[PDB]
């Protein structure tokens, strides 16, 4: 009845035309309304295979988010290699809305409903939908924010657990609230508050899950060994401002830990673009309180893989590849041609 196929999708959201928030604006121009009566048909006795690492859906979402960040977050001064490009840099209201990805006629989306599906292998519970769920195009690093939570277990997904260079997605079951704030009246100085209790607890649960994927070895957490600030720090956009949080505290086996954790954040104007090889400078931060309270719903890790001894294993945060962020939401979807 069907085969896997790569076709061009189309977006669908509930963006409001009167809204000034750029995500809403882009969506109203690029995407259609959501289905008011969405229907999902359970394929009984159907087992379907999935490979979340080869899903063209992700690639197409990537292209949308790039275009959206391009129309909505144009840099004042863009520096690609040696070229210097000056263009307007108006401050905008920037809060990501959910985007549904839908298939054209002749095609349909298969949705794996297995409770602890690692993204690759057979799905004993396949469903069929016309669109995916509402995915916020949240662009982050080290910490996946505002994503979908795992139902029942911490899930560990990697293209290749053996290849240390391959990123490790950590899908959490319980969110860890992170409250990041730039106080009103160094304008470039901010901080992210995290309840140390929850984080420590969650962090232990993920050690266990790592153990079961890595030979009950001892799990060690460390800050990133090096690289760009966007990678060595928890990077994310809040209200149009580019935050950089220092997550050194969050990633170390220290667990008086019941305390509140305050991460040193900085608002940057000069950044490295994730969209591609290029650097961008934006105007100084807006006035007044700048507060984003997000839910940490996943973690991006990277195993050292010394491959010298079985004494221990070490994990560090990373995740500059934003296709891994879309992958973490689109893992349960595939596009097939009827």
């Amino acid at each position: 009845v069907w085969k896997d196929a790569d076709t061009t999708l189309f977006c669908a959201s509930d963006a409001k035309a009167h809204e000034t928030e750029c995500h809403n604006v882009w969506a109203t121009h690029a995407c259609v309304p959501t289905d008011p009566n969405p229907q999902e048909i359970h394929l009984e006795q159907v087992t379907e295979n999935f490979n979340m690492w080869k899903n063209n859906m992700v690639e197409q979402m990537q292209e949308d988010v790039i275009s959206l960040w391009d129309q909505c977050l144009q840099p004042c001064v863009k520096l690609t290699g040696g070229s210097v490009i000056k263009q307007a840099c108006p401050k905008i209201s920037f809060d990501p809305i959910p985007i549904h990805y839908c298939t054209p006629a002749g095609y349909v989306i298969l949705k794996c409903n297995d409770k602890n599906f690692n993204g690759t292998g057979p799905c004993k519970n396949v469903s069929s939908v016309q669109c995916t769920h509402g995915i916020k195009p949240v662009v982050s690093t080290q910490l996946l924010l505002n994503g979908s939570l795992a139902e029942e277990e911490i899930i560990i997904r990697s293209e290749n657990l053996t290849n240390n260079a391959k990123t490790i997605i950590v899908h959490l079951q319980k969110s860890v609230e992170i409250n990041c704030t730039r106080p009103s009246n160094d304008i470039r100085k901010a901080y992210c508050e995290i309840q140390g209790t929850k984080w420590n607890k969650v962090l232990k649960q993920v050690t266990e899950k790592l153990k079961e994927h890595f030979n009950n070895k001892t799990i060690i957490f460390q800050p990133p060994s090096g690289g760009d600030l966007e990678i060595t720090m928890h990077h994310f956009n809040c209200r149009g401002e580019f935050f950089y949080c220092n997550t050194t505290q969050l990633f170390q086996n220290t667990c008086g830990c019941n305390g509140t954790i305050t991460l040193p954040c900085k608002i940057k104007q000069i950044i490295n673009m994730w969209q591609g090889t290029g650097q961008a400078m934006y105007a100084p931060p807006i006035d007044g309180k700048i507060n984003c309270v997000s839910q940490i719903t996943g973690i991006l890790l990277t195993r050292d893989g010394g491959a010298n001894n079985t004494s221990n294993e070490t994990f560090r945060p990373g995740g500059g590849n934003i296709k891994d962020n879309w992958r973490s939401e689109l893992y349960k979807y595939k596009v097939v041609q009827i």
Epitope: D4, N49, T120
Partner: antibody
Framework: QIHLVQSGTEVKKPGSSVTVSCKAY?????????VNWVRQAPGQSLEYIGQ??????????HFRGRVLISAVDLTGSSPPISSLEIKNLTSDDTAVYFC??????????????????????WGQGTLISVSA | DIQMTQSPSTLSASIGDTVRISCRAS???????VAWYQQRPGKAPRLLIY???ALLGGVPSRFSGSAAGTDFTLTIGNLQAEDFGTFYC?????????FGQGTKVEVKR
């Protein structure tokens, strides 16, 4: 690409038990790749021993209870591993044993038929000599 | 339990010739679930054709398949050095997979 690397030659005596292993390098998961064990006696043709598919073990009725086929998925330290164990070894088990693997992802590929398939990727083979 | 019997046991062929190697099952295989392998001496067997006629990726187009009920046959055009060896037919219509006797394609002289 895929390269199935099998264990070394085994020279065992009658009645004993032997376990061989297949390291399926380049394989993403045995959830998409079925593993089939096939042996070939010296001067003879190939005979299918058994398999593991969707993490469900099986063997030809010719080897019921004498054969044990198991497999573990990809880990941080090693590729996917399959293993064949054989008890009550005889001189008629002096064949060269092959670990073979085949992708079962494309359900409508000609390769496989509901657990029964052709054998795409072949290992190096491992010789087992059973003699007193 | 299906039995595959091949014909002939061995055939002598020259370079460039077209080799026909047939194989027959104890019962009818509707799904055409048959494969053809080649085996070099001392080396593992290579898969050449699957599902009766479907030619595997990387394998020369000189290899052809033919599938009809109980009778299947491998056709090799423009034969060449690497082609000489032992060819096997296999059925995967029903459990368990069964091989043919094999066919030794050897240089005529």
């Amino acid at each position: 690409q895929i390269h199935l690397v099998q264990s070394g030659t085994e020279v065992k005596k009658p009645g004993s038990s032997v376990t061989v292993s297949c390291k399926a390098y380049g394989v993403n998961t045995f959830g998409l790749y079925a593993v089939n064990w096939v042996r070939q006696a010296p001067g003879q043709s190939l005979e299918y021993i058994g398999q593991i598919w969707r993490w469900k073990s099986s063997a030809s009725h010719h080897f019921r209870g004498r054969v044990l086929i198991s497999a573990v998925d990809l880990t941080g330290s090693s590729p996917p591993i399959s293993s064949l164990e054989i008890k009550n070894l005889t001189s008629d088990d002096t064949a060269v044993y092959f670990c073979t693997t085949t992708s079962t992802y494309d359900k409508w590929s000609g390769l496989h038929h509901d657990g029964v398939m052709a054998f795409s990727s072949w290992g190096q083979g491992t010789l087992i000599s059973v003699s007193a | 339990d299906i039995q595959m019997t091949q014909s002939p046991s061995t055939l002598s062929a020259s370079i460039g010739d077209t080799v026909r190697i047939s194989c027959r099952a104890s019962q009818s295989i509707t799904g055409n679930w048959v494969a053809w392998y080649q085996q070099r001496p001392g080396k593992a067997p290579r898969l050449l054709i699957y599902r009766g006629a479907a030619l595997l990726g990387g394998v020369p187009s000189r290899f052809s398949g033919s599938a009809a009920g109980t009778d299947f046959t491998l056709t090799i055009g423009n034969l060449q050095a690497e082609d000489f060896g032992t060819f096997y037919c296999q059925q995967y219509d029903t459990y368990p997979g069964t091989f043919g006797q094999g066919t030794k394609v050897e240089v005529k002289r």
